[PDB]
Amino acid sequence: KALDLKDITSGRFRPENIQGVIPMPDGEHYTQMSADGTQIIKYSFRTGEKVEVIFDVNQARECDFKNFDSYQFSPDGDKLLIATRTTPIYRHSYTAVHYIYPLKRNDKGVTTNNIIERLSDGGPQQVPVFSPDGTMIAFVRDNNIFLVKLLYGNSESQVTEDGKQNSVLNGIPDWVYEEEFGFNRALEFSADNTMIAFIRFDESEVPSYSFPMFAGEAPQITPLKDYPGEYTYKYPKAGYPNSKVEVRTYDIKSHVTRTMKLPIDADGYIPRIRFTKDASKLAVMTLNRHQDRFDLYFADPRSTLCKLVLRDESPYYIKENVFDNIKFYPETFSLLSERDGFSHLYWYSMGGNLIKKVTNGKYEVKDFLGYDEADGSFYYTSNEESPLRKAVYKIDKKGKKLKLSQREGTNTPLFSQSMKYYMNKFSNLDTPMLVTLNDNTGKTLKTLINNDQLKQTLSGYAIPQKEFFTFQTTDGVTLNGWMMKPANFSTSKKYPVLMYQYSGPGSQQVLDTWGISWETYMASLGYIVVCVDGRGTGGRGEAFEKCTYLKIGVKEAKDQVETALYLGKQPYVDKDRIGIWGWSYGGYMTLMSMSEGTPVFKAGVAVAAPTDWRFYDTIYTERFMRTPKENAEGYKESSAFTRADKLHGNLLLVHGMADDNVHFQNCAEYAEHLVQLGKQFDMQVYTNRNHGIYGGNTRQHLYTRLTNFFLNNL
Amino acid sequence: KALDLKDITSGRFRPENIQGVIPMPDGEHYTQMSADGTQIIKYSFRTGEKVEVIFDVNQARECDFKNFDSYQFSPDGDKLLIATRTTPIYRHSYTAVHYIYPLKRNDKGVTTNNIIERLSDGGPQQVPVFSPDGTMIAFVRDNNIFLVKLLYGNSESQVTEDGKQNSVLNGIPDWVYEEEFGFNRALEFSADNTMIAFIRFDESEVPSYSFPMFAGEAPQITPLKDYPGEYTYKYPKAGYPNSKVEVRTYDIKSHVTRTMKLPIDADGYIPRIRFTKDASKLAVMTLNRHQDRFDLYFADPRSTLCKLVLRDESPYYIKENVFDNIKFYPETFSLLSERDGFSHLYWYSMGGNLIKKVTNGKYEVKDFLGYDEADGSFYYTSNEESPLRKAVYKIDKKGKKLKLSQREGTNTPLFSQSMKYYMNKFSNLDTPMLVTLNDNTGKTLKTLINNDQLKQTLSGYAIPQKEFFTFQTTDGVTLNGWMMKPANFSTSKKYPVLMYQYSGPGSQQVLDTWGISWETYMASLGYIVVCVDGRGTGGRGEAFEKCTYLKIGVKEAKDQVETALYLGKQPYVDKDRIGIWGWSYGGYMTLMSMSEGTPVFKAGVAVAAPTDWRFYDTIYTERFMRTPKENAEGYKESSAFTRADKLHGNLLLVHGMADDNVHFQNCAEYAEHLVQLGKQFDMQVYTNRNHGIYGGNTRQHLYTRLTNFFLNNL
Secondary structure, three states: OOOHHHHHHHHOOOOOOOOEEEOOOOOOEEEOOOOOOEEEEEEEEOOOOOOEEEOOOOOOOOOOOOOOOEEEOOOOEEEEEEEEEEEEEOOOOOOEEEEEEOOOOOOOOOOOOOOOOEOOOOEEEEEEEEEEOOOOOEEEEOEEEEEEEHHHOOOEEEEOOOOEOOOOEEEEOHHHHHHHHOOOOEEEEEEOOOEEEEEEEEEOOOOOOEEEEOOOEEEEHHHHOOOOOEEEEEOOOOOOOOOEEEEEEEEEEOEEEOOOOOOOOOOEEEEEEEOOOOOEEEEEEEEEEOOEEEEEEEEEEOOEEEEEEEEEOOOEEEEEEEEHHHHHEOEEEEEOOOOOOOOEEEEEEEEOOOEEEOOOOOOOOEEEEEEEEOEEEEEEEOOOOOOOOOOEEEEEEOOOOEEEEOOOOOEEEEEOOOOOOEEEEEEEEEEEOOOOOEOOOOOOEEEEOOOOHHHHHHHOOOOEEEEEEEEOOOOOOOOEEEEEEOOOOOOOOOEEEEEEOOOOOOOOOOOOOOOOOHHHHHHOOOOOOEEEOOOOOOOOOOOHHHHHHHOOOOHHHHOOOOOOHHHHHOOOEEEEEEEEEEEEEHHHHHHHHOOOHHHHHHEEEEEEOOOHHOOOEHHHHHHHHHOOOOOOOHHHHHOOOOOOHHHEEEEEEEEOOOOOOOOOOOHHHHHHHHHHHHHEEEEEEEEOOOOOOOOOOHHHHHHOOOOHHHHOOO | OOOOOOHHHHOOOOOOOOOOOEOOOOOOOOEEEEEOOOEEEEEEEOOOOEEEEEEEOOOOEEEOOOOOOEEEEEEOOOEEEEEEEEOOOOOEEEEEEEEEEEEEOOOOOOOOEEEEEEEOOOEEEEEEEEEEOOOEEEEOOOOEEEEEEOOOOOOOEOOOOEOOOOOOOEOOOHHHHHHHHOOOOEEEEEEOEEEEEEEEEOOOOOEEEEEEEEOOOOOOHHHOOOOOOOEEEOOOOOOOOOOOOEEEEEEEEOOOOEEOOOOOOOEEEEEEEOOOOOOEEEEEEEEOOOOOEEEEEOOOOOOEEEEEEEEEEOOOOHHHHHHOOOOOOOOOEEEOOOOOOOOOEEEOOOOEEEEEEOOOOOOOOOEEEEEEEEOOOOEEOOOOOOOEEEEEEEEEOOOOOEEOOOOEEEEEEEOOOOOOEEEEEEEEEEEEEEEEEOOOOOOOOEEEEOOOOHHHHHHOOOEEEEEEEEEEEEOEEEEEEEEEEEEOOOOOEEEEEEEEEOOOOOOOOOOOOOOOOOOHHHHHHHEEEEEEEEOOOOOOOOOHHHOOOOOOOOOHHHHHHHHHHHHOOOOOEEEEEEEEEEOHHHHHHHHHHHHHOOOOEEEEEOOOOOOOHHOOOOHHHHHHOOOOOOHHHHHHHHHOOHHHHOOOEEEEEEEEEEOOOOOOHHHHHHHHHHHOOOOEEEEEEOOOOOOOOOOOOOOHHHHHHHHHHHHHHO
């Protein structure tokens, strides 16, 4: 009956789902890994029926591994590439030991008894990728590119030889490009399988950063039991130099390497490369350092000449999410753009001329899912119903729009290769997770998962319920929030309040989707829990998000104060027992809101918080703030240091000491500022932990610490 | 009339004293620094009369400094060496800019109007020392020895050329020798002024240790404002290799350097060198790695031959106090030895034969003050009155003992060169500093300082008072303690208790001497404050101190638990509100005591605490524990990690992150062990702070944090 935090932290209430869903090249089937990671099994998109087991570690020949982590198909589906021993590096990068598995059917009529072969005889590999004809795989290892020719006995050749850790990266981004342009690979085959292209990152002049590593626990780093070690990598802080970047091509036949003569500012960016359907056209996406001029080039991989295809210019900045929504077709390509104030889908000719604006209106297109070359329909997700929701839509060749989603909430689709079917994952405030198979019209073909068991289990517990609300700030802005109330709620009682937020640019926490979290636990203890997405958050167009430009944090903190004030006007909240907390930008926002000047907060917890933007990285910080050289006044007003003497309420600072994202420096420097100001506060510092602060009992310990801090300090 | 924490942390109640007292060669006078640091003044030991100002910042010619830090007298009485700009390195090492001040008299007979001279035209100097005839000064800079010849234009020469930071040190000890053998100089002139002797430390193969540095404040390390830095030095942890050491001599006339052919274990120590009165005999003190075999050699600085003079072995270990109580006379020398279970004074001939044991009884000799060659009398300090006290004693040639000190408490003497007078600094629980001049029967000749003004100031405040008590443990051990009750105290009421201790081997906190501390402040807030010296503390003989040998912490923690249990039996103590705290070893003991298994503590604070002895340095740790591989089961039973699952009560961990003594690693590794056990605790980590955790507002912030933590956790 009573909600138990350990059940929350252990994932007891995580809804059933399907992991490792990979659509097959035929457009009719998908595959999924079995629960134990022993098998890859093929299922029908049209019916959900199991077709056959495609791969099985207990049937494959020469298979030394017990489990695998992930897999991908070759483009024609005749082979699998299977990843084992996946070892994360940063958020998106990792190494793994990959294996090639052919799917030819055997004497007995099964595909499961074939010989598995190593991708490489050397060490683990990064970002392997098939050629369009499936005859080659390129991968990166020790910052160099390698090429394996599957029709040549898996013969391996070395494409680059100047890769050097902390100096030169070939085919993979450095830390800041990876985190802030959100990708792990800059390595492409041309459409006729004759050229490789890659970005070469010269980070030799980027500043290095190092932090200590101890032995710790979960995992214990046993070589460090007596003397600590360290982790060193290149990380440019705001205004410092970024990697020098070049686009290079490798002629597979002739072994010749060339550099594309790309017009680009000396301090500009290349967020992505992508070969088109035209073997002579490599797309190169570029940004200026202000990140407000997105210039798309077509490079000839042999002549090295580049032509400007289009420029998308923002009055503020271009956002990273546009880059992976550019999909190339014969004769056309897609683009997401906020040029009219809202994220919308645009359809261009391969000559760079706009063919049509596919979507319009005061809502945001979230994902471009694809163009059906058969009938000319476009598929995409959008929040047209409401900033809180997401639905699947289709627009036919004549401009007719159809909402495919059957239920209102959060619909996440996964389309078949042919766009004929898709798997839908649906959630809302009281629907944990419904997984369905659907046709092109959105009609439900089969319910795979309804999580009735979880629903039954949860029925025996007293679970506080989320509800949405809106309110108007004193200057007339309407904000979306949710409120979770304790059991036996009464408007004649007086409740303490915990505010949760994240508040970062373009982000949203107030969404019609299901979850049980530490906030639910606090509500079960008798707290009213509230989350409001203030100004600067996403879902509501460019004007709402980018009104923070060049002076972030300030308006967001005002809107959190406004939220506390609105709550204080309610007869059932105790105005003196309002707490606030958050993680990452939400931790920074805890600091900014508690030192805003309006003394509304009794207590707060800041987890892994940036405290001065000069400590954070170039691409993210400068996107919103430009450089400290150009915007000293903005950095001043956005710093938590500047307003620290106005800190009001009992503060707990939490940080992982091995945080490669928001450096522990942020906490150490800010703590010392508070010491010299004479402010008293609490700390919890986690050994060897990164931005996610997890491992072993860490998460349970942390949320118990947060629980007790608010119990004691509210 | 309430005590104010700021007055305590600002040192408002520091008693008046006398700085830089040096006895002059005539045996009749001493010099001292003026209280403002602008003058050096000669006084009479017999009368206290001010004889003359010897040096005056405002009278010297070409004197560019306004104050100075310290000074030394040339043995020939013709010069001062004055130190300015003293810049600490570790506990005892420092640089300073030194000046030679001639003491010639002018036409008006005074010494105050001479032209001051620089010791060196180069950079700041370390540990300058005069030759016996006063014509030469040797000093250390950049790990090399330099020689200044005052007879020949202050001509400077370079004695060693191989000194190199973190590799080779000439004439000064490495980190662990300085900290744990308690000295800063290994540099000596022979009795006839012809030879220099020094220890050369080769720490090239000692492991490096590094910790981060941030910008911080007070001081701000400005180059680290955007990117942190680091501090690196050599620090051998328990069982790791120590410096390779040898004794070298330098022939001042011929410039020949020789190495003494000293038999020493390959892993042994040379804690001191000291030239005797015989120009051909250099005393070299050596230990084995177990530190239980003290071998005294006489080295011939020209022939390099060494002869073993004396071997003193302990069943446990030899203590640092012996080294600087070896004083050399023509034909004799002194030694303190615990061979009979108590530190006693032994008298040897220069041939190495024991002449006699001078002192005896069940008490400890603390300082050997000197031998009066005129009448054969010995002067020393001891705790014969009580482990709590220290008095000055005299034993004549016949063996009659006389106690010189007039008052019972803590008597610290400084004798004239003839041993005919001494200056006495006296304190007890009710007496801040009382400074007198005395003759060698102990008779008070003059009271120089009695601190009536401080007494007056304190009379206007409600000051809790210490009083001594004893109690017997359940095992029958009688322990000494003090107890400070609020000035409100009544046997009617029940009080919370704060226990303070240090508890480290041979230390004592329960002493008949005056102080006002944070403990005084807590008592003034209504806590009963108690301190007990458990087993393993000093002052009670070798059996009582060294019963912890090879398994430290364990018995000390039992005695703190016994202390809490005794207090819990008292009718005026609330046994549910007993807390404990300490710093350094006292922080380690807080951890050990709160996890002893008997749940007697409600809260505790561990400041800068060692947590596993394998993290701490060679000389200290191995003195009590030997190495980890020799004593694996002792290191396990002494580790705070082993018993952490029994931690009971609310704990606050405090640590400076730049602690070069007890590494922050101790706290980070122990915090993580607690996280995985699921124990809740608070933290306060101070950026850029060392073992003393101070700087700007730091101490006031830290003791405010300690105060509130106990107030809130009771």
